[PDB]
Amino acid sequence: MKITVLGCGALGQLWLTALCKQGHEVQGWLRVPQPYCSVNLVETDGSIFNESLTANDPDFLATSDLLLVTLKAWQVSDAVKSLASTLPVTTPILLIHNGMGTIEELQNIQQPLLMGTTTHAARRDGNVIIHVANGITHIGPARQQDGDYSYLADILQTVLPDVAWHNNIRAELWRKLAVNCVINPLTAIWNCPNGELRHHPQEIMQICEEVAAVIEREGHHTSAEDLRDYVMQVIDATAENISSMLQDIRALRHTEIDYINGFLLRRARAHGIAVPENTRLFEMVKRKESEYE
Ligand SMILES: NC(=O)c1ccc[n+]([C@@H]2O[C@H](COP(=O)([O-])OP(=O)(O)OC[C@H]3O[C@@H](n4cnc5c(N)ncnc54)[C@H](OP(=O)(O)O)[C@@H]3O)[C@@H](O)[C@H]2O)c1
């Protein structure tokens, strides 16, 4: 299948590497256009894939069977909208990122729009990406109008195992957002690894109560307790890790907060729910960003 990968960072390079290993015809698509993109990936078994692939070829884009998007959340929608008039109108666009709120920015996309999450882990080490862990990628329809693109799950399963189609992708994204709304800003603010959060059960529950209330109003069934339990399982499995938001903070990079607690606050406002803890986290992180930027 012919694929354009938008965003040639850790995840994009993972997918590019994996797609080439199965013989799919690919290109990259970069922010700062160049004719080629550098893929340097170390697989879980130590094998090395170092390759220069086509990038930013608009004719290639115009005849792609899939636009795979692996940008950070705040990068996604402007970059997609700018390619959308080139991409065939029948060609699916698959978004894989953390956070939510990009789909709301992409309501007028005429292409089929698919949302994805993944538990694979890929980490930048200089100009090398390392595939740290294998995992599971779920994809589904981004919007109410988006139809059955399960065939893509079947293809991508053979590229980067495991991939599954989920019609209820949105509910899954909301649960992952709950976890993200706890772990990312608290670790960012406290400058601590994820496991330190277990010494704050009350604050964790409070955030979980706010998010559960938004989730219920959105039509997905969950409870504060269930969200809390899922948070603790993620903290337990990542206790020693530095969160992606804390990494951003420490590297003086823009964070995904407008698509994590920020999104949660936009949906809270639209259902008139008060979310004072989430608000504090969002504002605290925005202030930390303004200390650089
Ligand atoms: N990496 C993982 O293990 C992992 C796992 C699960 C989910 N995710 C999620 O996947 C998303 C991407 O993560 P990542 O780790 O791959 O991020 P990353 O390494 O920062 O990759 C993003 C790439 O897209 C580029 N970019 C920004 N704006 C662009 C534009 N307009 N056009 C083209 N390229 C543009 C970046 O280049 P510049 O930095 O030069 O702008 C970068 O190379 C995030 O939401 C993350 O939370 C990541």
Side-chain angles (χ1 to χ4, degrees), residues 1-126 128-220 222-268 270-293:
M1 151 167 78
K2 191 166 178 184
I3 300 158
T4 290
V5 185
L6 172 65
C8 298
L11 205 65
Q13 280 177 56
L14 178 56
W15 278 98
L16 282 165
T17 295
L19 288 157
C20 283
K21 288 183 173 151
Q22 301 303 317
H24 296 271
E25 191 188 2
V26 304
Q27 82 164 334
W29 199 280
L30 300 155
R31 183 167 60 79
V32 176
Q34 306 282 339
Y36 60 79
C37 60
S38 291
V39 177
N40 245 59
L41 188 115
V42 180
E43 260 301 353
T44 51
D45 74 351
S47 63
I48 296 178
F49 184 88
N50 187 225
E51 191 60 23
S52 272
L53 297 178
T54 296
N56 295 61
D57 182 326
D59 312 279
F60 194 113
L61 181 59
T63 52
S64 288
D65 301 309
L66 176 71
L67 177 66
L68 179 60
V69 187
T70 49
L71 298 171
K72 299 246 212 135
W74 57 268
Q75 296 155 358
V76 167
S77 61
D78 289 338
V80 172
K81 286 176 199 166
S82 90
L83 307 189
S85 72
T86 293
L87 196 77
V89 70
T90 48
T91 278
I93 299 169
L94 170 61
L95 310 173
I96 301 177
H97 55 82
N98 283 340
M100 287 173 78
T102 60
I103 292 160
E104 287 76 7
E105 299 166 341
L106 292 174
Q107 290 297 310
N108 304 325
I109 292 288
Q110 301 182 153
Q111 288 83 9
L113 190 60
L114 311 177
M115 186 64 218
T117 54
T118 189
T119 55
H120 280 260
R123 188 223 313 133
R124 184 175 289 284
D125 266 34
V128 181
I129 303 306
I130 297 157
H131 193 195
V132 170
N134 279 118
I136 293 157
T137 301
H138 285 182
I139 68 175
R143 313 159 295 187
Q144 171 74 76
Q145 70 242 41
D146 299 295
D148 180 1
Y149 285 86
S150 63
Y151 79 86
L152 295 172
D154 303 330
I155 297 176
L156 300 179
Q157 163 68 23
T158 67
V159 173
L160 194 67
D162 293 316
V163 183
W165 177 263
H166 280 258
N167 258 94
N168 212 16
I169 192 69
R170 199 160 175 82
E172 166 170 5
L173 296 176
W174 268 113
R175 294 218 337 142
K176 292 198 188 182
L177 187 82
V179 177
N180 199 345
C181 276
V182 173
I183 296 179
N184 257 337
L186 291 181
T187 54
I189 290 165
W190 292 339
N191 188 39
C192 68
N194 291 5
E196 173 62 10
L197 273 44
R198 78 168 57 80
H199 296 279
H200 300 264
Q202 295 289 116
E203 288 157 281
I204 287 168
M205 195 45 152
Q206 185 186 15
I207 294 156
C208 285
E209 280 157 1
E210 294 166 13
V211 174
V214 176
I215 294 177
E216 207 80 354
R217 240 103 129 179
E218 293 284 315
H220 321 295
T222 190
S223 62
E225 288 71 18
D226 266 306
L227 259 21
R228 184 208 53 219
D229 291 330
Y230 183 38
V231 172
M232 296 320 310
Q233 182 186 311
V234 172
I235 287 166
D236 281 344
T238 58
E240 305 301 331
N241 295 354
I242 307 309
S243 74
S244 76
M245 194 173 280
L246 180 57
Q247 287 187 59
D248 286 345
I249 285 296
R250 285 176 168 181
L252 318 181
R253 291 198 297 260
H254 192 97
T255 79
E256 291 194 284
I257 191 76
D258 289 306
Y259 296 85
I260 303 168
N261 305 71
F263 175 67
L264 189 274
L265 294 205
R266 288 188 299 277
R267 300 314 300 149
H271 295 282
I273 298 162
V275 289
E277 181 63 356
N278 268 289
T279 299
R280 271 191 287 269
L281 304 194
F282 174 79
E283 293 179 2
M284 185 67 244
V285 165
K286 291 318 250 162
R287 292 177 46 204
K288 291 189 79 75
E289 285 186 347
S290 71
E291 274 162 26
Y292 49 99
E293 309 228 296

